[PDB]
């Protein structure tokens, strides 16, 4: 089996200077012709082209080449010593392409997806990101069937042919890697707008959607204009073409793609209106539209040397999107949401069998590395430069990065060196953030003696499958101090008297001396989640109530609440285990009452403070896990909270209905009241399931936007009443024509805690609006089921067998989706023996499939072997 290793990187033997492409689209076949201008770098080496499309011909300077094709590689030994041309002709059947990588059909239109290695599914090429070329693309198609013909860059020519056909030619003058190629052909509607760059140049903006979907694109257009302006104001970065196209597609393996000047978006990240999309959905559009635009500099103008460097573009662009969203509105709440995501989804990755560094040292299938570690831990790593350097220093690094590397394909090391060099500091130890996997664990203890608060901190990083030796890392720990009434206490550190400091841990163990401390203190630690680590410090439950009630930092208050909930769940696990009554949780209930009643808290922040960690967070670090015991303990906690405060959940609901004030459109202010209301709805229906019939009676009146419809449906989704099934059927009927709302229906089907979810899911497979071949549908139904703790982890193994069967089926046509799904089994080694045995059986059955993809094989191997 082939493994690719970062240590084996070598510059290409050949460059491609110019890439001329011609697409002749017919029914059913598209013929692609290329003309490649090739420049030897290591003269005399064989020319090796990657490719998997049907090959019709290959020429070297106009003459039939003497070549061999074996597997997905075409090799020509007989090549000239000077510049030469290669012409390839391939044939593609796009409607047969259910992988959604390469050239494929969707909705009767044609789209491409090339990142990372899809271009080689279109033609034979040197399909690696360090080969940058200047592309010109000609497209010829039936004008009635495909009136819209797009590719990267500037449209330089076009015309009509007398048999009903037409053509266009696009020139993209910026040399680029093949992964950023795109082509679209279709009958699509356009929404036009524009932005004027700070140098005074207009940029024509065009969003292409189905005709029916066009009324839902306006928020995405506004978001793009906001993102363009922000990259100018915050980073000094301007767009570089007079045209920026975005195309929505409903069959897409990921959220969006930054193809130069012609971004391609999953509909879920471009279409919204308040009737059909939730506030969270609007927030997502804003994030993703921003993300793809930000890639124009961080990814496109400066690209990746090789795919091991993916985080160079993705960590940095995620950081950029996070900062954009934060600057738009609600920064602290949005930062907590990001940290919560990281801990819920990336920490388990780093603790599991598929753990990898931010910059992996090897891979078998690169599509298995578009992960939370590369993206979200990647962004934390970027954010640490900002914490260490400040905004001004961070911008000095950015400035040198582009000065050095505009137009090049570079590495994570180059980014680090620009930050270091622009600021005149040594960041050599920081490199370990790219090369060492695993979540660092800090053990800290503190002591006020004399007038010094002495904080001792030790760090360790566990072995991961790829590496045992982990050396000490460069870890910024942001700190303050609270007195007995929870106000800030100043202290002295490196000459400055302040109420906050960043303590830079670089050794395995260090002591920090915060001097001049005149009162009894409790430290506030890792403020703003200043490094992506586990911190253990001995806090009493009273210390936690103090932090929650009084700390000035959002993260540390939220962390105090999270810790109180974790301790409460642990207490419930102990009683349920001893067969005794549940704990009183008197102190937790006191703290929650204070939160509910505090009217100075931001409402979205209140909502977060009332969220209990997920089962996966709760069983982090455990062995021999019975997931249903954790689910039982967590549900008992939520039930206690629901019942104990029932009258107050209704009261907060009413206050939020009043403060929303009939403002049903999306805005950040209205959205935070709604977020709060939806937390209250959930608790009300937990305590009083019969309230579902009152809900039903007044549904139409409550259903004023999709945030409310989703909030209600989410709250009743686990209810055993027949009404729950009736409300869901009514939802499916009401929104049957909106594929993105049908995704929500299937997600409710798959996520329900009712006892009958598995057979409802099986029925849903055959719903007329379900398609297994559509990634959004498959993720919503099957994906949700795979994350549905009581059902996926059912003792009988029915959940495991069902998910295994669907990995097997999906893998036949879309290995990417299948390899993401099969990660539901990642907990295997840590499960109690009965479930573990069943998980291993499911994974052996997957392995035993003939023709199993490399994608799924790589993952299964990591879990099993
Ligand atoms: N490393 C710099 C570089 C190298 C190679 C190609 C480019 C493309 C760019 C594109 P273009 O010829 O389409 C130019 N006329 C666009 C001007 C413009 C218009 C509107 C908004 C921003 C910029 C140009 O030469 O400015 C840049
Ligand atoms: N942090 C804001 C945010 C939230 C959710 C989704 C995204 C876009 C990113 C897509 P991307 O720009 O990184 C793209 N380079 C991924 C490449 C890819 C690979 C395979 C198939 C389709 C697309 C993704 O799908 O995770 C962004
Ligand atoms: Zn990206």
From TrEMBL:
Per the UniProt record, one Pfam family is: Peptidase_M1_N
Q: Which residues form the Aminopeptidase N-like N-terminal domain?
A: 81-180
EC annotation?
3.4.11.2
- Molecular function GO terms recorded: alanyl aminopeptidase activity; metallopeptidase activity; zinc ion binding
The protein's required cofactors: Zn(2+)
What domain of life does the UniProt record list for this protein's source? Bacteria
**Is Metal-binding one of the keywords UniProt gives this record?**
yes
Q: Which reaction does it catalyse?
A: Release of an N-terminal amino acid, Xaa-|-Yaa- from a peptide, amide or arylamide. Xaa is preferably Ala, but may be most amino acids including Pro (slow action). When a terminal hydrophobic residue is followed by a prolyl residue, the two may be released as an intact Xaa-Pro dipeptide
Q: Where is the Peptidase M1 alanyl aminopeptidase C-terminal domain?
A: 541-864
All copies of the Peptidase M1 alanyl aminopeptidase Ig-like fold domain together span 438-537
Per its UniProt record, what Gene3D superfamilies does this chain match? Answer: 2.60.40.1840, 3.30.2010.30, Neutral Protease Domain 2, Peptidase M1, alanyl aminopeptidase, C-terminal domain, tricorn interacting facor f3 domain
Q: Which GO terms describe its biological process?
A: proteolysis
Keywords on record: Aminopeptidase, Hydrolase, Metal-binding, Metalloprotease, Protease, Zinc
InterPro entries, per the entry: Aminopeptidase_N-like_N, Aminopeptidase_N-like_N_sf, PepN_Ig-like_sf, Peptidase_M1, Peptidase_M1_dom, Peptidase_M1_pepN, Peptidase_M1_pepN_C, Peptidase_M1_pepN_C_sf
What is its EC class? Answer: hydrolase
Residue ranges occupied by any Peptidase M1 membrane alanine aminopeptidase domain in the UniProt entry: 219-430
Q: Which family does it belong to?
A: Belongs to the peptidase M1 family.
Record's function text: Aminopeptidase N is involved in the degradation of intracellular peptides generated by protein breakdown during normal growth as well as in response to nutrient starvation.
Record protein name field: Aminopeptidase N
- The record lists the organism as Neisseria meningitidis serogroup B / serotype 15 (strain H44/76)
List the taxonomic lineage.
Answer: Bacteria, Pseudomonadati, Pseudomonadota, Betaproteobacteria, Neisseriales
């Amino acid at each position: 089996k082939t493994v690719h290793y970062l240590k084996d990187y070598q510059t290409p033997a050949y460059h491609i200077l110019k890439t001329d492409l011609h697409f002749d689209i017919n029914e059913p076949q598209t013929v692609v012709k290329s003309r490649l201008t090739v420049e030897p770098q290591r003269v005399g080496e064989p020319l090796v082209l990657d490719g998997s499309a049907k090959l019709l011909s290959v020429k070297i300077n106009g003459a039939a080449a003497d070549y061999v094709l074996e597997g997905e590689t075409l090799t020509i030994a007989g090549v000239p010593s000077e510049r030469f041309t290669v012409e390839v002709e391939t044939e593609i059947l796009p409607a047969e392409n259910k992988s959604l990588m390469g050239l494929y059909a969707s909705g009767g239109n044609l789209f491409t997806q090339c990142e990372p290695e899809g271009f080689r599914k279109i033609t034979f090429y040197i399909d690696r990101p360090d080969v940058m070329s200047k592309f010109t693309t000609t497209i010829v198609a039936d004008k009635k069937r495909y009136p819209v013909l797009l590719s990267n860059g500037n449209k330089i020519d076009g015309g009509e042919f007398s048999d009903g056909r037409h053509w266009v030619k696009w020139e993209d003058p910026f040399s680029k890697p093949s992964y950023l190629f795109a082509l679209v052909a279709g009958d699509l509607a356009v929404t036009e707008d524009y932005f004027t760059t700070m140098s005074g140049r207009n940029v024509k903006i065009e969003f292409y959607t189905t005709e029916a979907d066009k009324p839902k694109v306006g928020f995405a257009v506004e978001s793009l204009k906001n993102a363009m302006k922000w990259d100018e104001t915050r980073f000094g970065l301007e767009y570089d073409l007079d045209i920026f196209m975005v195309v929505a597609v409903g069959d897409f393996n990921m959220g969006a793609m930054e193809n130069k000047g012609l971004n391609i978006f999953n509909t879920k990240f471009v279409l919204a209106d308040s009737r059909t999309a939730t506030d969270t959905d609007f927030e997502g559009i804003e994030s993703v539209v921003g993300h793809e635009y930000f890639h124009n500099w961080t990814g496109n103008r400066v690209t990746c040397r090789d795919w091991f460097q993916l985080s160079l573009k993705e960590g940095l662009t995620v950081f950029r999107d996070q900062e954009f969203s934060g600057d738009r509105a609600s920064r602290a709440v949005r930062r907590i949401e990001n940290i919560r995501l990281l801990r819920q989804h990336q920490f388990p990755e780093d603790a599991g069998p598929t753990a990898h560094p931010v910059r992996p040292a090897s891979y078998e299938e690169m599509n298995n590395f578009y992960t939370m570690t590369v993206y979200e831990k990647g962004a934390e790593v970027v954010r640490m430069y900002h914490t260490l350097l400040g905004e001004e220093g961070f911008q000095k690094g950015m400035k040198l990065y582009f000065q050095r590397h505009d137009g090049q394909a570079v590495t994570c090391d180059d980014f680090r060196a620009a930050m270091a060099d622009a600021n005149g500091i040594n960041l050599d130890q920081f490199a370990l953030w790219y090369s060492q996997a695993g979540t660092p664990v800090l053990e800290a203890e503190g002591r006020l003696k004399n007038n010094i608060f002495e904080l001792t901190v030790k760090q360790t990083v566990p072995p991961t499958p790829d590496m045992t030796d982990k050396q000490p890392m460069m870890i910024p720990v942001k700190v303050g101090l609270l007195n007995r009434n929870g106000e800030a206490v100043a202290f002295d550190y490196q000459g400055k008297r302040a109420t906050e400091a960043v303590l830079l841990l670089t050794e395995a163990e260090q002591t920090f001396l915060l001097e001049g401390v005149t009162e009894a203190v409790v430290p506030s630690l890792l403020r703003g989640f200043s490094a992506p680590v586990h911190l253990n410090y001995p806090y009493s439950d009273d210390d936690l109530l103090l932090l929650l009630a009084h700390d000035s930092d959002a993260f540390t208050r939220w962390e105090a609440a999270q810790t109180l909930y974790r301790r409460a769940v642990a207490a419930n696990l102990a009683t349920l285990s001893d067969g005794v009554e549940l704990p009183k949780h008197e102190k937790l209930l006191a703290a929650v009452e204070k939160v509910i009643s505090d009217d100075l808290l931001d409402n979205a922040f209140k909502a977060l403070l009332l969220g209990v960690p997920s089962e996966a967070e709760l069983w982090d670090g455990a062995e021999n896990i019975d997931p249903l015991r954790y689910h039982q303990a967590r549900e008992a906690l939520l039930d206690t909270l629901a019942v104990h405060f029932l009258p107050k959940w209704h009261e907060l609901n009413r206050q939020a209905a009043k403060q929303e004030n009939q403002s049903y459109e999306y805005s950040p202010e209205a959205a935070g009241w709604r977020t709060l209301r939806n937390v209250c709805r959930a608790f009300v229906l937990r305590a009083d399931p019969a309230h579902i019939e009152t809900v039903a009676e007044k549904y139409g009146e409550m259903a004023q936007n999709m945030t409310h419809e989703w909030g209600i449906l989410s709250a009743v989704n686990g209810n055993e009443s027949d009404t729950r099934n009736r409300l869901l059927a009514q939802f499916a009927d009401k929104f049957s024509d909106d594929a993105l709302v049908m995704d929500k229906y299937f997600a409710l089907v798959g996520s329900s805690r009712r006892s009958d979810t598995l057979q409802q899911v099986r029925t849903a497979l055959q719903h007329p609006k379900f398609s297994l071949e559509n990634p959004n549908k498959a993720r919503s139904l099957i994906g949700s089921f795979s994350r549905n703790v009581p059902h996926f982890h059912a003792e009988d193994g029915s959940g495991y067998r069902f998910i295994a069967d669907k990995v097997i089926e999906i893998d036949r046509f879309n290995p990417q989706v299948a390899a993401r799904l099969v990660q539901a089994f990642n907990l295997c080694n840590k499960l109690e023996p009965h479930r573990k045995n069943l998980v291993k059986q499911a994974l052996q059955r997957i392995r035993a499939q003939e023709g199993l993809s490399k994608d799924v094989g790589e993952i299964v191997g990591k879990i099993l072997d």
